[PDB]
Amino acid sequence: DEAAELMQQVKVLKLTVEDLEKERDFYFGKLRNIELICQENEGENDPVLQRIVDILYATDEGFVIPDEGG
Amino acid sequence: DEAAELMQQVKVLKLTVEDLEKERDFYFGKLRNIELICQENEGENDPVLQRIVDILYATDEGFVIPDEGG
């Protein structure tokens, strides 16, 4: 019975994982599309793309977390 | 002992969740920054922003999944 409760818990946990995985990948490849426009107009016509490139490499909460791993 | 194995499993599962949560939110608010540039130049100077706006509302794998919920 003890594990049976966790059987349900790993369910909601992994489903949140799967829900997040599709979001992570979907949006991740999306920045690549915005970079696509950058690699087209950068240094050629539009400087606006450069400041959007900064976005893609700007990391929010750049705190050095101790003990990273899996 | 049975649940003890799942105790480790919910650990890696939730940690993947937390790893994904920070990615989901980080990048999510990031599109908002690219939209920020859009809401500035759109209809005023640069049409390039409009095609990046399309990005933010373009959904990959627009398959209608049956039985959605939590």
Q: What is the C-alpha to C-alpha distance for residues A29 and A34, in angstroms, rounded to an integer? A: 9
- Mutation target vs A (from B12, B13, B49, B51; most A CBs, 10 A cutoff): B13
Residue type, A47: P
Alpha-carbon distances of A17 from B12, B31, B43, B70, rounded to whole Å: 10, 21, 39, 12
Number of domains present in the structure of chain B: 1
Q: What is the C-alpha to C-alpha distance for residues A46 and B17, in angstroms, rounded to an integer? A: 38
CATH of the domain at A16: 1.20.5.1430
Q: What is the C-alpha to C-alpha distance for residues B40 and B36, in angstroms, rounded to an integer? A: 6
Provide the residue range defining the domain that includes B29. Answer: 1-70
Say which experimental method was used: NMR
- Mutation target vs A (from B8, B46, B63, B65; most A CBs, 10 A cutoff): B46
Contact list, A61 vs chain B (CB under 8 Å): 22, 26
